Structure 1
């Protein structure tokens, strides 16, 4: 669904910098840290990640039409 895909695009793009700023962070604490950063981001920035994910979903669906 759209919230999950928007979050996944953002976190994959941001994971390296978040981890670099938190040396030694555990798997579990990184999951929690990322959740807090997302909640702190502005509504507009999160809508921007949703727009990027919707673009990628549309591209995938188009390419899958070509495949099938």
Structure 2
């Protein structure tokens, strides 16, 4: 199928798991507080190759889905 949900950053990949880790320490948080805590934690996260490999995988399937967007429009 055409029209993909676009690819993500290495940040967004980690933020989804960090949301659950931040919920364990702060009960009032949802997503925007996790984005602020996220900014300070990602600044200190060297060797981010897990997060970079997962977003690079999403970029390859995005390029595949985008090829079908030109085949169907």
Scaled to the shorter chain, the TM-score interval is 0.5 to 0.7
Q: Alignment length, in residue pairs?
A: 63
Cα offsets for 1:39-58 (capped at 9, x unmatched) = 2222x1x2331221011111
What are the ranges of 5 or more consecutive residues in structure 2 without an aligned counterpart? 1-7
TM, length-normalised to structure 2: 0.61
Taking the aligned partners of 2:30 and 2:61, their CA distance within structure 1 comes to 34
TM, length-normalised to structure 1: 0.64
Taking the aligned partners of 1:55 and 1:29, their CA distance within structure 2 comes to 27
Taking the aligned partners of 1:62 and 1:52, their CA distance within structure 2 comes to 16
Equivalent of 1:58, from 52, 57, 60? 60
Larger Rg: 2
Cα offsets for 1:4-55 (capped at 9, x unmatched) = 711011112331222232112476543221111112222x1x2331221011
Taking only aligned residues, the RMSD between alpha carbons, in angstroms, comes to: 2.5
